[PDB]
Amino acid sequence: GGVKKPL
């Protein structure tokens, strides 16, 4: 996986 970003 990568980085979890919020919307």
Add this chain to the structure above:
Amino acid sequence: PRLWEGQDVLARWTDGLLYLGTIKKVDSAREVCLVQFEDDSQFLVLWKDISPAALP
């Protein structure tokens, strides 16, 4: 596969810098590759630190 043995890639070290590397063995379960570098050294590099050294 997006990654394969013998593929030329760009890998990020802990310094944050990209180095030309060559993939030697891929472990898809751990998202990790063996990558060898111009000094013949070998490291295990997380997939998130690997990008192909070639545009699609």
